[PDB]
RNA sequence: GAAACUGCGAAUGGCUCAUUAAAUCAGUUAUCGUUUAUUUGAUAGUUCCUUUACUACAUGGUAUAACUGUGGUAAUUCUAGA
RNA sequence: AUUCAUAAUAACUUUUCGAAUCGCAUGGCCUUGUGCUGGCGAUGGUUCAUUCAAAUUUCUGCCCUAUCAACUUUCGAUGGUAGGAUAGUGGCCUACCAUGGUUUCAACGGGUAACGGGGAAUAAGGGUUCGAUUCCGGAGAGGGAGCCUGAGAAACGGCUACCA
């Protein structure tokens, strides 16, 4: 699926396109709201923390 | 059917109006006012109907957003503004004034009146209350509201009114033998003193009238507007002074003026 | 061109329209009807106010020759006419131009595809821009 | 001066005659039985506080559209995150 | 005609309103503070009045029908008390209580290829027949119900649900 990732202390934003159900897996059952540690989802991401915002299904 | 009803089919309109069949289809509806729908004259109706000043509505609202009518002392800008008896209106071009008053045919005459008598105005005190604070206020015909009246005015007497400013400065007490105006019902035009009042409790009080020409009539209270004595009225009366003749007299007269 | 004759009745000086207004009433024998250039020149030096601030129009001629009747006005200057007639009447006469439009419904229809939209549009096209990709 | 916010209007108008037989409607009443945008005319010296170490009145608070920018869906006057 | 308009007392309130707004002009005034004053009119604002309304409402007046004679209270029918609800009266609704209400002067029921009225056609008169339809009133937006906004809608070129 794609991620749509924002950094609100620079108001950039640039997304992200993650295959492989592993990586995406790290989301599953979690919230909007709910904080994500990052390396799970790629290997930049170590480090960073993601909060869940919302987003669009298919369709 | 819901809501305030916003339109005037012509042939809905009132007669005394004057309007024509055709030509169109809508009348103007009167403005929310100082008087009533369906006894009113509009500015449009007045100044192109009557003074034929305008020909199309469009330049009566060109003739009026110049501020060049005024009413009563004061401007106003709405083409349907509901003028209505007793109220003035004004031309400082042209330096024309106009009292609105009625025939004998029951519609409003285009009536000039001087400069002087144009700065003052007749009220029918419509009900007298006690107001909140203890203040006592009149309300006249017309929907002004007065603070203060004199304490010997009762509804149905007459009330001279200055324009200029806000204020009574004179009042006419309904009594037996006072000039009256009769504004509605058939006798609408009519003039004449009063000779006696029927009383009836609980609805519709009766005001025999009698003209100078010993001629008699009745009317609804409702109906009556003193306006003077005996000779002298307080405002000056259109030609024909609300006499009313047989259409017999009205033919003579006509056919009496008749060689060029 | 046979004398004519302008003749104009019922007049009223207007002020509160800046302007003087009447009947016009045209004997023209010999003569099937006068036209109304003619009528607003010959006016002009009648009232002394010059043929580009009079205004001329009704006029049906009479039946079985003769006789047209129409009515007239003149105002006071051109700055009034030009504010105080109607505009398809300054179109007649050469004093303003026919500022043509789309049809009245290609108007309408321009209006209601416009309602589809919701704020300046150009962000629209850059993100129907980005669809000619998938 | 686009867009957008705010205000007002969209309850008027136009159409039709399915329903409806004391209903509607007409003429005539009543509100000492109520609501009433608007128009018009009136109408407001009082707002704080155990009432000297005193309160923003020379005027107090953010949170949002449009917008910028990252997006989703075959698809609508769909709309999400920043 | 009133327990009316208006006022007074004791309190009450998740305290209503009592201008943190806008446009033109820039002027007076002396203790010289950019002091203190100040013109015309916009938009708003509470309460009362007025105007445009609305909602109910009194009296009388409808076509055919007895091969419709009794009808009304199931699960309000008719009245009384109190409340609740409403903008407000009222069985409008609820609780208690009573047994009322309409009818050959035709109730009740059925029919209507019935919206009502202003009116139309027919010309001795008396009548007979017609009015979906230019104006007034009412009702509806495929059918039913529900409701949001709002002064005003049970709105359909508004929404919600079910049915088609
Ligand atoms: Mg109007
Ligand atoms: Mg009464
Ligand atoms: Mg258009
Ligand atoms: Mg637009
Ligand atoms: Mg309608
Ligand atoms: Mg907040
Ligand atoms: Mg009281
Ligand atoms: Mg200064
Ligand atoms: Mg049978
Ligand atoms: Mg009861
Ligand atoms: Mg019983
Ligand atoms: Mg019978
Ligand atoms: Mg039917
Ligand atoms: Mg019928
Ligand atoms: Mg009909
Ligand atoms: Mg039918
Ligand atoms: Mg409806
Ligand atoms: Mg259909
Ligand atoms: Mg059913
Ligand atoms: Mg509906
Ligand atoms: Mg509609």
Same mark, same amino acid.
């Given at each position: 699926?794609?991620?749509?990732?924002?950094?609100? !202390?620079?108001?950039?934003?640039?997304?992200?396109?993650?295959?492989?159900?592993?990586?995406?897996?790290?989301?599953?059952?979690?919230?909007?709201?709910?904080?994500?540690?990052?390396?799970? !989802?790629?290997?930049?991401?170590?480090?960073? !923390?993601?909060?869940?915002?919302?987003?669009?299904?298919?369709? | 059917?819901?809501?305030?009803?916003?339109?005037?089919?012509?042939?809905?309109?009132?007669?005394?109006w004057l309007l024509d069949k055709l030509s169109g289809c809508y009348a103007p509806r009167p403005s929310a006012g100082p008087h009533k729908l369906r006894e009113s004259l509009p500015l449009i109706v007045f100044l192109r109907n009557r003074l034929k000043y305008a020909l199309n509505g469009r330049e009566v609202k060109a003739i009026l957003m110049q501020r060049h009518v005024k009413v009563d002392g004061k401007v106003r800008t709405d083409t349907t503004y509901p003028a209505g008896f007793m109220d003035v209106i004004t031309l400082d071009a042209t330096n024309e004034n106009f009292r609105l008053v009625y025939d004998v045919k029951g519609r409003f005459a285009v009536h000039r009146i001087t400069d002087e008598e144009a700065s003052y105005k007749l009220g #029918?005190?419509?009900?007298?209350?006690?107001?909140?604070?203890?203040?006592?206020?009149?309300?006249?015909?017309?929907?002004?509201?007065?603070?203060?009246? +004199?304490?010997?005015?009762?509804?149905?007497?007459?009330?001279?009114? +200055?324009?200029?400013?806000?204020?009574?400065?004179?009042?006419? #007490?309904?009594?037996?033998?006072?000039?009256?105006?009769?504004?509605?019902?058939?006798?609408?035009?009519?003039?004449?003193?009063?000779?006696?009042?029927?009383?009836? +409790?609980?609805?519709?009080?009766?005001?025999?009238?009698?003209?100078?020409?010993?001629?008699?009539?009745?009317?609804?209270?409702?109906?009556?507007?003193?306006?003077?004595?005996?000779?002298?009225?307080?405002?000056?009366?259109?030609?024909?002074?609300?006499?009313?003749?047989?259409?017999?007299?009205?033919? +003579?007269?006509?056919?009496?003026?008749?060689?060029? | 061109?046979?004398?004519?004759?302008?003749?104009?009745?019922?007049?009223?000086?207007?002020?509160?329209?800046?302007?003087?207004?009447?009947?016009?009433?045209?004997?023209?024998?010999?003569?099937?009807?006068?036209?109304?250039?003619?009528?607003?020149?010959?006016?002009?030096?009648?009232?002394?106010?010059?043929?580009?601030?009079?205004?001329?129009?009704?006029?049906?001629?009479?039946?079985?020759?003769?006789?047209?009747?129409?009515?007239?006005?003149?105002?006071?200057?051109?700055?009034?006419?030009?504010?105080?007639?109607?505009?398809?009447?300054?179109?007649?006469?050469?004093?303003?131009?026919?500022?043509?439009?789309?049809?009245?419904?290609?108007?309408?229809?321009?209006?209601?595809?416009?309602?589809?939209?919701?704020?300046?549009?150009?962000?629209?096209?850059?993100?129907?821009?980005?669809?000619?990709?998938?």
């Amino acid at each position: 699926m794609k991620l749509n990732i924002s950094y609100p !202390v620079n108001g950039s934003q640039k997304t992200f396109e993650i295959d492989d159900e592993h990586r995406i897996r790290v989301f599953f059952d979690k919230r909007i709201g709910q904080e994500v540690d990052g390396e799970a !989802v790629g290997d930049e991401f170590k480090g960073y !923390v993601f909060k869940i915002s919302g987003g669009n299904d298919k369709q | 059917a819901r809501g305030p009803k916003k339109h005037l089919k012509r042939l809905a309109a009132p007669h005394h109006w004057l309007l024509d069949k055709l030509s169109g289809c809508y009348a103007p509806r009167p403005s929310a006012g100082p008087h009533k729908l369906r006894e009113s004259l509009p500015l449009i109706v007045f100044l192109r109907n009557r003074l034929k000043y305008a020909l199309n509505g469009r330049e009566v609202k060109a003739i009026l957003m110049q501020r060049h009518v005024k009413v009563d002392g004061k401007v106003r800008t709405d083409t349907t503004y509901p003028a209505g008896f007793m109220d003035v209106i004004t031309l400082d071009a042209t330096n024309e004034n106009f009292r609105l008053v009625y025939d004998v045919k029951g519609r409003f005459a285009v009536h000039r009146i001087t400069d002087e008598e144009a700065s003052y105005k007749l009220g #029918k005190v419509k009900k007298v209350q006690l107001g909140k604070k203890g203040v006592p206020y009149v309300v006249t015909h017309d929907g002004r509201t007065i603070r203060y009246p +004199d304490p010997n005015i009762k509804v149905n007497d007459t009330v001279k009114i +200055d324009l200029a400013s806000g204020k009574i400065t004179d009042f006419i #007490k309904f009594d037996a033998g006072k000039l009256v105006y009769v504004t509605g019902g058939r006798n609408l035009g009519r003039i004449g003193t009063i000779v006696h009042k029927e009383r009836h +409790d609980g609805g519709f009080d009766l005001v025999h009238i009698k003209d100078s020409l010993d001629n008699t009539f009745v009317t609804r209270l409702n109906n009556v507007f003193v306006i003077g004595e005996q000779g002298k009225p307080y405002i000056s009366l259109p030609k024909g002074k609300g006499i009313k003749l047989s259409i017999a007299e009205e033919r +003579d007269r006509r056919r009496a003026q008749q060689g060029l | 061109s046979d004398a004519v004759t302008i003749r104009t009745r019922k007049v009223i000086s207007n002020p509160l329209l800046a302007r003087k207004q009447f009947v016009v009433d045209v004997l023209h024998p010999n003569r099937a009807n006068v036209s109304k250039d003619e009528l607003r020149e010959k006016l002009a030096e009648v009232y002394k106010a010059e043929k580009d601030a009079v205004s001329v129009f009704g006029f049906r001629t009479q039946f079985g020759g003769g006789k047209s009747v129409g009515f007239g006005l003149v105002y006071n200057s051109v700055a009034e006419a030009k504010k105080f007639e109607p505009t398809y009447r300054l179109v007649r006469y050469g004093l303003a131009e026919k500022v043509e439009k789309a049809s009245r419904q290609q108007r309408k229809q321009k209006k209601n595809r416009d309602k589809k939209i919701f704020g300046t549009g150009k962000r629209l096209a850059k993100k129907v821009a980005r669809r000619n990709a998938d």
